[PDB]
Structure formats: structure tokens, C-alpha cells
Amino acid sequence: AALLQCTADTLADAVLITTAHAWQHQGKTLFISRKTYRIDGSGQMAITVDVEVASDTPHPARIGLNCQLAQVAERVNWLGLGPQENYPDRLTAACFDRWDLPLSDMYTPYVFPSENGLRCGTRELNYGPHQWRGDFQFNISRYSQQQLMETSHRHLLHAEEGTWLNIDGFHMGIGGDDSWSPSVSAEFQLSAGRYHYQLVWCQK
Amino acid sequence: RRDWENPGVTQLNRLAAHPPFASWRNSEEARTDRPSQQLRSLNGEWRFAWFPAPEAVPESWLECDLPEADTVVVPSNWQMHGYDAPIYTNVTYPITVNPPFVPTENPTGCYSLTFNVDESWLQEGQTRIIFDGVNSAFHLWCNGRWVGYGQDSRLPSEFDLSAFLRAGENRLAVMVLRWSDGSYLEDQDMWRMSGIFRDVSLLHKPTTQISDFHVATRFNDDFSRAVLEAEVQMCGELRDYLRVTVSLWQGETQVASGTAPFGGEIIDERGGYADRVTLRLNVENPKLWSAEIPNLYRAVVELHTADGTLIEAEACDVGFREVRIENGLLLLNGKPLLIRGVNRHEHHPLHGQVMDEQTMVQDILLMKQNNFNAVRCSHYPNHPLWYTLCDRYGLYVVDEANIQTHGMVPMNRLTDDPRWLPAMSERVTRMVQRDRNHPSVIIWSLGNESGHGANHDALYRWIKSVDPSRPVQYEGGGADTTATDIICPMYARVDEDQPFPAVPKWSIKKWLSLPGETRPLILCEYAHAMGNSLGGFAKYWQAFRQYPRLQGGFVWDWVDQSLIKYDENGNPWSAYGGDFGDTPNDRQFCMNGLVFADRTPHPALTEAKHQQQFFQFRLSGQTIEVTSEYLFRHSDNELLHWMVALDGKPLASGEVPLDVAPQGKQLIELPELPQPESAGQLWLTVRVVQPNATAWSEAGHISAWQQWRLAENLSVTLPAASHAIPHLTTSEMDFCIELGNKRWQFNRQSGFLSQMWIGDKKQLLTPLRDQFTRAPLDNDIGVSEATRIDPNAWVERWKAAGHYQAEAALLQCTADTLADAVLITTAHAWQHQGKTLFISRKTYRIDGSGQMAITVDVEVASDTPHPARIGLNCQLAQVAERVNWLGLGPQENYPDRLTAACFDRWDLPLSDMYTPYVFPSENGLRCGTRELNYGPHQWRGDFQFNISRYSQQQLMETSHRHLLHAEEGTWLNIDGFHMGIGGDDSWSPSVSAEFQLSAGRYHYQLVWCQK
């Protein structure tokens, strides 16, 4: 990530932070992310994200944000598709409703660790004192994408400190027509070039 | 006798049908197809009197000319001379449905001609009269004496006048009836016209004459050998000294000849035909006929004596080709066809249903130039010259019998009735007898929309028996009946089933593989081109190319059926059904053409051209793969031009000759392209250019094109920090932003940008507001009317939801000052009677560079019908001459009709940004636009736009294009998103789900600045 812009403006009833980043590899700009964070007097932080994706780079796996929360809470509560893991090209079985599960249920123990436990079409997510609202896909677990990527077997995984949260405006299909050639259909690839999502982060 | 109310009487004293005759008395004239003195045209000035009924015709008209009669040009339709109103109706009959009876008020056209006949014509031989087209029925008199009667408006009626004519002055009297029992088989959806609308001629033959001839061409397995078989029939006295010679010519070279006396082979217990002979000519390595290469020979049939004296000669153009269906594929010369077809009615805006060579040639040229290879004679045999031209220019023809009974309840009432079999048989049999020698005819059709009856099955088998060289098709009764060799639906969709009872229209892909089904599928009608249409056209062609047994179709249709009317100042305007005082009518449903009546193209024609391309392209790295879709011809008149541009700025270009075999491939390696200095998207454009002129095109003709995105460099470089700081001024009614000379005014009561100034110059006439509606397209409306509402039609769903009446309620309007900018935040709710339809949330950011960044985020209630568009609109004060944009163009393009459009820098006059559809609607949109320039203004983003002197409101409220008036300034519509136009048909919703605005939440952003 290369920082292009980071400004702060004090408004009548809010503070507005504006940022711009470029992700580059060997001279090539892959992605540009432009954001505003508006924190108002009600204590809510509205995050607006606008992403550019180079048309000649391979379509990305996801367009989102991630962080490691210090909190480890017992339950995960959301208003979206569930209760089980669902992805854009595998979500017909899932139902839109209010779901409440133990954190461990938000992780799928695939023998070969990978991205897992996504829930799509989520309008509200609750974890400990935090609430995220918008229209997003998320997963939440004690395992980072890095660890999942670097660990060969599920039994070798160790719970990390706190909780890793991945919130996606957009997520690529998983495919599966076969498992030896690209099988994600065009309509589930992230090929639009420009992507927009908005999130509100507040305390319960 | 009232023969015009009797299906048992279709003719009286009519001669047999036959291929085109000229009775040359010189063989060389027959070879070269020069005019014949034995075939005399009676076209020109005739006398005409209109009557309300045949009973109203005075008995003196048979012998003497009427003083009340006017002089008119023949051929003509008498409605085009203003004698009565041309009635237009779709499904319903224009008369009372009571077969076989017609109205007592039956408009009667009394034609007459006084002409000279030379004694030499009457001293020997036979003089016949030929009426190529009389609508719908007629009685004939010659010198006061009754000659005969004829029906079928679309085939020649011929009568022997040898005993009726006298040396010197002769008078013909033709009583033409608008309505007859023949009308029940002539219920086509078009203008109901009448009169002598095709040629009238006299033909002199000797008494010993060629009465018929049939030409067949058969081939060996690889088409390297052929046998031409010519059956010749005679009339007159049989003599042993009589001979027939058939000679075959390739240009001026005679390739084969055969001579024989009369007397065919034994066929039964009674012997054979003494008045017939069959000649068989061997042809080695024949040059084959196709639409790609219309190679023709000339066959000359000589009737003569053994000592060498010619009696007469007839002749025809011969195309060596084989049409067969094998293993479910329609094949021509062993190769599977892909039909790039169109339906073509015979229509001229000035002459009605009268056809001329100039118009026919104009149509064929435009068709071939737009990659059509096929034409369906909807829905009747055509003027005889049409087939000659298709033979010579190369178009595949579906010849169709003049049988349509669409108004019957049920549709097969007459066609399943054995009492109507005689009349139906004549329409099929007489077409085959006339047109069977034309190579351009590859498929016979039994008619149109007449259900499926036993009469169809009988006539299907008749054709199969007499002419096995051509498949038979027929759509009626579900498109896949026992009376068709080809599954030939009308408006069956690509992926979507329409499971109507008894006659379902399956998805064409699904239809092929139904249990037991093996036949090819070629749509007799598809892609209804009514108004702003042809949305989803690319979906058909992708399917056609992927599925072997999907072999194309015929677009509905070629030409708008509008006629010319004049106002007070004598200025012409295009009129449809209902403008001529005819009621009940079917409004603008006569205008479904790819071209206007004057043959000016609609925007949809370019989409057709692109999808029907004969070359296919793929790109892999630096390699362009070109695939030929030609079946027979090498690419011997083709050059590939390639261009690489960065956001419209050309960086590299070149040309490479194409040398591709039919069905072959060519790989073209592009040279090392230098990496651009600037940020932006590189685009590759290729086009196939024809360097040499042809019979159908000019030098430089572009036949194919394609585009790809190459490398993109995203802009990361921060622009030089602007020194100027915009200032906010607040009043109770307005937020005002100032930057030097420039001013932006936001109205606080409405929440919209109401005005902009540069110095003292106002920029807006109407504020910038959200827009969620469009002036409804013909496809949006369907068959919905004010008296007969179709609640399923898109326009009615939008109306009932309050979309057009939606009023903006302000929720939020704030102003913030940033370090180097002013931020305006707004929120509006669009509500109809308590219901929130849409919410629009916006920010306007104006910085020291004078750029106004607009961000728009829209919520659409999930239970409201999906909106026509999600955009902004305003009336600009400026009227500028030019429109300049970086985006898809140059022509009008919509989300489901933008494949033909290319991404480049385009610059057109403002008037070219409006499409003059006869029925005004949303028009002129250009999609995928990143920059738009108009006068002092520049807009940047990723949007769809149209720009014109007409508001959406005026387009929607005005019935005809000629009633439109340029409004003050310029109406700009900038859409983040726009709904598809559809067009699979124009009587039910046809916008595919992927082109409907159903996402619920939408985001777009624009930048507005001075240029």
C-alpha cells in the first residue's frame, strides 16, 4: 500500500477523514482505494469506500477491509443470509433472517485450510460491543487469512489473539464445476473495474 | 353468379401457370436475356373509375369509355391516388368475418385501356394477356366480350385473347374487386390496398410452343460432377420433324448441349408423354451457386425443326446448387448454412405495394452491405424481378404461398376444411410452377399464421412429390408440425420458455433436444424491430454460433410500413395506421423495420451488421486469430486494419492482408507496441475492409469489426495542488459557492443545484434533478392502449406505481467547508401517495480547480417495478453545434444493444444525437462514456447519456416526430444506469433479467467542470 492522501476536516457536527491508497507491484498499480470516514456526534463512523481495479490485472478474490479485533466474544449475531457458510455462487440454500451462533460455528474446519465461513447479503453484524451496518459479506474467526494460507492441515492451526474480521463489499465465486481448471463463471468474477461499498461502524 | 363470393371458383378461363416466358424468335436474344418483341408491356396510362359496389357499375362501361373516369398510371394501388382509405389492421379482419361472404359495400375499381394490336399478332399464333398482380379479384372483358376471372393477388393471371382481339384498335375492361372469397386467404398484417398493382403485358407465342420447362441439377459426392436435367413440355400439333435443344452457357462459352425429338420414357401401362422430352447434360467441375459466390449459367431451350429452323426459344438463369437436410442440418452444397435473414414485405411509402427495380436493388444492396444473406417473402410470392435479382446478387430466398388466415377463430378454421383445399392448393401449386427454376429459392413456405390443418399436410406432400430439391417449411400450429421440415418458430426466445397452451414457444436451445426431435431450427421471425429495439440481438447470434442445429433466422422486419402525408404547407410526414381515418386500427404496429420507409437506416441496423459478421476474432497476448465463417469463398477481397489507442488518442496502427480459407483460421502477430507515457486504458480495434468494389459494395466497405481492452495504467499521480479556495455563502433559501468568476447555487427548499454562473452567464434553465423514468419505448408500451390497458406492460407498471408522478421530498440539505473545498450533502425521497419509491443521497464537492464532484447513491424499493433509468437531468442554457465524447459510438447504443458500438473519441453534430423514431421515445443514448463535452461543459465519470433539444416529457406526450419542437437550450440526461430496451417481441415484456435495474442500491459519480 502506497499512501497518496490523508486529510482531516473538522465540520459542524462531524470529523471527516479522507484517504487514498495505491497498491503497486514492480511499477504496476493494481488497485486504488479512495475512502472517507465521517465520525458524527452520535458516535457512528460512516466509511465510504471506492475501489479502482486495473482492467488488465487478474480479477481479485475480494474487495473489502480487514482487521484483528482485541475482543474475543462468545456469540456472533447478524441480519443476513444464513445460518450456514454461503458464497455468491453458493447461497441459494441460505435464508435472510436474524441469526445467532457461537463463534466456532463461523469457522468451517476444511481439512486443507482456506477462506471459509463467509456469510453473504448481510445488512447488520454484531460482535461484542461492535455493530457494522451496510450491505456486505463477512467472515469472523480466530484465524487470519495469512495463517489459513500458510497452514497445510486444519489440526496445525492455532487460535490467534483476538478475532480476525474480514468485511467484504464484494467477494468472488468459489466455483467447482471441476477442481483442476478455473471454474468460476464470468458473472461471479470481480470484473467491473470500479467498486463501491459503504459501512457504518458503531457501538451497541 | 357472384364468383367473388365462392371459394369453389378461383378462376374462369385462366391459362396454366408456368416459369417466366418471353417467346424469343432469336436464340442469341434468349441467351443474352435481351428484351423480346413478343413480350409487350401494357404499363402506362389507363382509364379508371371508382365504384362503391360492382352493382353500381354502368353497363356502358363494357363497350365505351366513361367521361367521369380519370387517367391513371398502371401499375398502381388506387388508395395511393386517394380514391378510398387504405385500411390497416393486425389480427382482426378489416371486414365482417362470415366466410365465404364479403361486404355488400365492396369498392370496385374499373380499369380500361384502348390500345393497338398489329394484324401479324392475330394472323398466326397465340396472343395472351398477363396480369402479374391484381388485388384481390377481377373480371376481364375484351372489346365488350367477357374473357375470364381470376383470384390470388400475388401471382400472374393469364388469358388467351386470340379470339377476342381485332386488327387495329382494341379495348380492355377490367373490373377489380377489393373484397372476394380470396381475401379470407389474404389476411396479412399490412395496408389493405387494391387495384392492378403489378405489370400488365401481352405475350405472343406460336401455336406449336414450349408450354413448360423444369431445370434440375444433380451432383456426385464432392460436387465435381453434375447433371443438368431439363424437362420440356409442348403445346400444339406434334410432328416427327420437331426437336428440342437445350444448350448451357457459362458467359459466352457453351459448355454443354443436347438435342432430342419429342417423346418421353414409358411411365405406365399407357406409355409415356408424347408431348414431352427430357434432356440430360453432363457438366464437369461446375461453378456452384451460393449467396457468397452467385455463379450463374444460362440454359436456353430451343424449339425447332430437324432441318434447323427455330420456332421459339425460352431461357433461364441456372445456379448449380444442392439443398438438403441431412442428420438434422440444412445443407447447401454439402455445407451447413447460417441464415442471416430478414423478412421483407413489398412496400414503398409513395407507391404503396407497387414494386420497382430501383427499390429492389436498393434493398438488396443495403441487405448485403449489412451482412444479410437471406430473405423471406413475407407473406406471398413477390414481383417476378425479385427472384432474378436474388439469383444474380446472391441471396437465399424462402418463397411463400399467398395464404394467411390470421383472423380466423380458431386459426385453422379454413385450413382444416376440405372445402377450402382447392383454393389453397392453387396458391401453393401456381407459386411452385412459376418459381421452381430460380436457384435463389432454397425453401418453400406453405404460407403464414393459418394454424395447422389437414390442407397443409396435403400440400406439404404435394411439394415434396413434385420438387424434392427444396425443403418445405411452415410455422402454423406450433412451428414443429408434420407440415414442416424445419422447426421455424416466430419470436421464440433464446433461453426463456413461453409455454402457451397447444402452441408453446420453447427456448430455441431447449426446442432442439425435445424428446424425439431431430430437425434444424431456423426462426421464420425473430428480433421484432419496432421503434427503439433489437435489444438482446447478440444473445441470438451467440446461440446460433454455439449450436450446430440452430441455423439462424429472419429478422422482423426490413422496412417500416409508413406512408407519406402532407400538411398545410405541403411538407411531407410519415403516417401509420390510424392517420388515414381507418378504424379500428393497430396504430404504429406497421413500423417494425430495420430501415425507415425511405431506406434510411435505424440505429438497430448496425447491431445486426456486427452480429451477422462473417469473420470471428479472438485475442491472445499479441496474437489476433481470425476465423472465416464463409462456407465456400476464400477471403480474396479483405484486408485487416488494426488500431491501438489510449483514451481515443491513436498510438499505433497497421494493415495485414487476410488470406483465410472458408471455415479456416489466420493468426496475426501484432508488432511490439510501445508503452504509453500517459495514464489510461489502451484499446485495440480491428476492422475487415474490402479494398475492391463489388456488384453490391463500394471500395473500402467495412464488413467486420471488433474491440478489446489492452493494458491499463491507473492514474496515481496527484494533480498540482490548487491555490484557489472556494467560498460558501449562506442565505435562508440558498447555499452559494464562489470561486473567482464562478458561482454554484443550491436551493435549500428543493435541495437541488438550481443555477450556475460563469460571470453574468447563467448555465441552467431547469435545475439538476434525479430522473428515474424514460419516455416509453414501443417495447415498454406493447399492446397497451388508453381504452385497453395491459397492466403487465412496463409503461403501465411504471404508471401505476407513480414513477412518472413521483414528487421529491427533501430530507437533508447541508453545507460544510473543507480545507480546500465546499461540501454540499443532500437527501431526497421520491414518494407516490405515501409510498417511498426511491431515495437519493448526494454529495457535491467543489474544489479550487472549479471541478464539481457529484456522488449519487440511490435506494430503490424492492417492491416497486424496476425503474427505466437511474440518472440526473437538467436543461442547459447553451445550444452548441457539436457533441464530443469518449465512449461507445458513434451511433445510438443501449445496454442490451451496444455490441456494434466502439469505444473511441467521437464528434458529431447535435442533431445526430437524436434518433427520429416516427413514434417519439427515449432515444439517442450512448453508453460506457467516460467523458462528455458540450459547449463550455465537461462531464467525467462512467455513465450513459443522451443530449437533445427535446425533453423526455415532450417525447412522451407527442404522438408523431413531425409534431416535435426544439425547446430552449439543451436537455441533458446523464444516467449512472439505464434499463435494457428488449425487443424479442413487442407485445409482452422482453427486457432480459440481466438488463433490468433490480439491484436495489445503486452508486454513480460524476465530475462537472468548465472545459
Ligand SMILES: [Mg+2]
Ligand atoms: Mg435463493
Ligand SMILES: [Mg+2]
Ligand atoms: Mg371465388
Ligand SMILES: [Mg+2]
Ligand atoms: Mg464486442
Ligand code: NA
Ligand atoms: Na492452506
Ligand code: NA
Ligand atoms: Na448454428
Ligand code: NA
Ligand atoms: Na406489424
Ligand code: NA
Ligand atoms: Na485478401
Ligand code: NA
Ligand atoms: Na410519444
